Structure 1
């Protein structure tokens, strides 16, 4: 598949969502928790890049994926 910016966020959005349901049961899996914050951080720096390059794509991507916008 492609490697566009919005596509990487879509895969992380599923990779993140897939692990939340896992931690509801295996909450003591702290090694996976260290991996969960990576994908949460990788998308943070990509969306941080998408923001200052084009705000139109930002408002459209966050609207369909139901993403919380950051203050400041």
Structure 2
């Protein structure tokens, strides 16, 4: 489970300014952290299908915010991708 001291590291990092907890970057970051953990869980435990539906939704919420962000600040998008190294 991702506890507070880890979730922090991420937010504090991808925040756009001290105190920002819910900006698109911070979300896409946070989600990516969750996807990656889940995909490891599912490399063993291939049989856990209920969890796999969770992941289908997280992947979907992420490609949804990116799709928005690559329309509001397409250089701020380019940067998020690079920073994570995702969607490619």
Cα shift at 1:52: 1.0
Tell me how far apart the structure 2 counterparts of residues 43 and 68 of structure 1 sit (CA, whole Å).
Answer: 10
Query: Where do 1:15-26 residues align within 5 Å?
Result: 15-26=34-45
Tell me how far apart the structure 2 counterparts of residues 39 and 68 of structure 1 sit (CA, whole Å).
Answer: 14
Q: Does 1:13 align with 2:13?
A: no
Tell me how far apart the structure 2 counterparts of residues 5 and 68 of structure 1 sit (CA, whole Å).
Answer: 15
Tell me how far apart the structure 1 counterparts of residues 48 and 57 of structure 2 sit (CA, whole Å).
Answer: 15
Tell me how far apart the structure 1 counterparts of residues 84 and 24 of structure 2 sit (CA, whole Å).
Answer: 14
Aligned length: 69
Higher RCO (CA 8 Å, separation ≥ 6 residues):
1
Could you tell me the TM-score, scaled by structure 1's length? 0.90
Tell me how far apart the structure 2 counterparts of residues 52 and 9 of structure 1 sit (CA, whole Å).
Answer: 15
Structure 2 residues without counterparts, runs of 5 or longer: 1-10, 12-20
Structure 1 residues without counterparts, runs of 5 or longer: none
| Structure 1 segments (4+ residues) deviating >3 Å | none
Cα shift at 1:68: 2.0
Cα shift at 1:54: 1.0
RMSD across aligned positions (CA) = 1.1
